[PDB]
């Protein structure tokens, strides 16, 4: 912990500066340091943690997919051998991606999930756990690929059970969870029908709850319902 020397409040203030600077590596290191102070995270602080690591791992996933595509093209029939460089560099990026996923899963495990009592915090962390097991699953090819997928499904399912009992169908974390769990069904678990069914059901129940919302809550929820509808338009 190179952040163990900095004040929790200064770590949070600098995570926000780093976001405005688009310095997501710094933002994640700052939020990592804030979590390691051992206090629970506020709603705003959870978003900073999530936003920071999503941008870091998003840059790595984009790079992994470009290199994996170049590597597959060089394994065609009539492809000209170019040596091990494509595979070595795809392995390097992949190893770096797995380290970020393991760092995040380590923070949720020590000890964010076990101290998260409120529905909103616990559903948020269990979603994050499903998401980062999902990113590991995107690059997994060995024996543990099945175990990684089940680790993602298991965390997603527990978040879904809580969010169904404890949150309205329009709650943005509940809709974001359903969006992501749906995509997991589609492209990780080979369950495109389950993916479509969850997205349609999530969209319909939120639509029926919109009348209870203020104009700002209504804008938050409708934004996420539009992402559900876009996925459904793409898959049907």
């Amino acid at each position: 912990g190179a952040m163990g020397s900095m004040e929790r409040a200064s770590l949070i203030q600098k995570a926000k500066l780093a976001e405005q600077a688009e310095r997501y590596e710094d933002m994640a290191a700052f939020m990592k340091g804030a979590v390691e102070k051992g206090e629970e995270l506020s709603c705003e602080e959870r978003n900073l943690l999530s936003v920071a690591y999503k941008n870091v791992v998003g840059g790595q996933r984009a790079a992994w997919r470009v290199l994996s595509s170049i590597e597959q093209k060089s394994n065609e029939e009539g492809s000209e051998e170019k040596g091990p460089e494509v595979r070595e560099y795809r392995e390097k990026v992949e190893t770096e991606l797995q380290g970020v996923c393991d760092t995040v899963l380590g923070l949720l495990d020590s000890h964010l999930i076990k101290e998260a009592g409120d529905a909103e915090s616990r559903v948020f962390y269990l979603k994050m756990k499903g998401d980062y097991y999902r990113y590991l699953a995107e690059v997994a090819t060995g024996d543990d690929k099945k175990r990684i997928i089940d680790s993602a499904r298991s965390a997603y399912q527990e978040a879904m059970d809580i969010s169904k009992k404890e949150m309205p169908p329009t709650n943005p974390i509940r809709l974001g969870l359903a969006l992501n769990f749906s995509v997991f069904h589609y492209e990780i678990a080979n369950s495109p029908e389950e993916a479509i069914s969850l997205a349609k059901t999530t969209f319909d129940e939120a639509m029926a709850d919109l009348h209870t919302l203020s104009e700002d809550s209504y804008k938050d929820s409708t934004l996420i319902m539009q992402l559900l509808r876009d996925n459904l338009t793409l898959w049907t």
């Binding site: 999503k54 995509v183 996420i224 992402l227």
Partner: peptide
């Protein structure tokens, strides 16, 4: 057009 997940990159 990539399917959507949340949160999205900057």
């Amino acid at each position: 057009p990539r399917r959507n997940t949340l949160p999205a990159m900057d």
